[PDB]
Design a binder for this molecule. Sequence first.
Ligand SMILES: *[C@@H]1O[C@H](CO)[C@@H](O[C@@H]2O[C@H](CO)[C@@H](O)[C@H](O)[C@H]2NC(C)=O)[C@H](O)[C@H]1NC(C)=O
Ligand SMILES: *[C@@H]1O[C@H](CO)[C@@H](O[C@@H]2O[C@H](CO)[C@@H](O)[C@H](O)[C@H]2NC(C)=O)[C@H](O)[C@H]1NC(C)=O
Ligand SMILES: *[C@@H]1O[C@H](CO[C@@H]2O[C@@H](C)[C@@H](O)[C@@H](O)[C@@H]2O)[C@@H](O)[C@H](O)[C@H]1NC(C)=O
Lengths: 124, 137
Amino acid sequence: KLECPQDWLSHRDKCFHVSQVSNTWKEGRIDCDKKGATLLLIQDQEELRFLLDSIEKYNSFWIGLSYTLTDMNWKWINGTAFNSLKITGVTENGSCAAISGEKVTSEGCSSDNRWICQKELNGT
Amino acid sequence: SCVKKFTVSERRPPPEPGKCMSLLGSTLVNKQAANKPVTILKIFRCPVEEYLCMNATWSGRLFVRTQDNREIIFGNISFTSTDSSPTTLTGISTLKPWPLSSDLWIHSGTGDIYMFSNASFSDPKCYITLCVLRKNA
Ligand SMILES: *[C@@H]1O[C@H](CO)[C@@H](O[C@@H]2O[C@H](CO)[C@@H](O)[C@H](O)[C@H]2NC(C)=O)[C@H](O)[C@H]1NC(C)=O
Ligand SMILES: *[C@@H]1O[C@H](CO)[C@@H](O[C@@H]2O[C@H](CO)[C@@H](O)[C@H](O)[C@H]2NC(C)=O)[C@H](O)[C@H]1NC(C)=O
Ligand SMILES: *[C@@H]1O[C@H](CO[C@@H]2O[C@@H](C)[C@@H](O)[C@@H](O)[C@@H]2O)[C@@H](O)[C@H](O)[C@H]1NC(C)=O
């Protein structure tokens, strides 16, 4: 068991930080890096429902998933390609993903949202 | 004077004449002041390019999410762009009776959405459709 930082949420093999500050997906990404963390990488629906039940939940929160122009595909910031969790939207209306209420929605990267940072275990 | 720019999208190009594109989100205009307990006034803007500098139309739907994950579309908005002039607001329609509290309203001058941070609903967002027009449309 790893000691989790001050005012950070703990669930399974992860530490979570919900921002109160709103900004673009890129500025959100930079902020998680300055904290020695990365944007949220959703493992499963159990991790998702933990956050929903402990988050003000009606607002959108940037997650570590975007449409990368080099790959021309939806990819997690960890390099893993996205599979069906489903991204909701009738149309292509943005290249950046966010948890909207309970659903995962695509939104414009230049939009301003809060974000969830994560610190995950990777050995000893 | 009008210098062509496209910053309302960072990973997608603007439509060619005469195609359209869907844009979802909102900007927090007073971001620097707002990111610094008290109820505060947040100003929001639709994903609309001020210096698009091409004959185009913007048509959007404004909404919030409630405490029970329901989406409330409180209004419609339109803007036009010209090759010679910056983007101008051309109309606003609000849902009557007003489905929200007095803690959110749309400004008539610009199409800016003014909200108090004490609101019992989410930050406003615009579903915009940008249609770039063909030469002499
Ligand atoms: C990158 O992040 C993704 C998303 O969090 C991880 O994907 C999960 O992988 C496990 C198996 O290790 C699956 O059981 C889950 O269903 C996956 N979730 C989703 C939503 O894809 C992935 O493991 C991470 N990749 C690396 C290399 O660490
Ligand atoms: C963009 O729209 C403007 C209209 O706002 C077009 O300007 C007109 O151009 C014709 C000549 O082609 C003139 O006779 C008109 O007086 C102009 N109208 C105004 C109100 O200025 C312009 O041509 C359009 N641009 C493109 C590339 O099609
Ligand atoms: C929400 O806030 C409304 C107005 O807020 C005002 O502006 C801030 C910046 C402060 O000056 C504050 O004292 C003001 O009240 C209120 O009119 C309204 O009652 C509030 N609504 C709820 C649900 O609390």
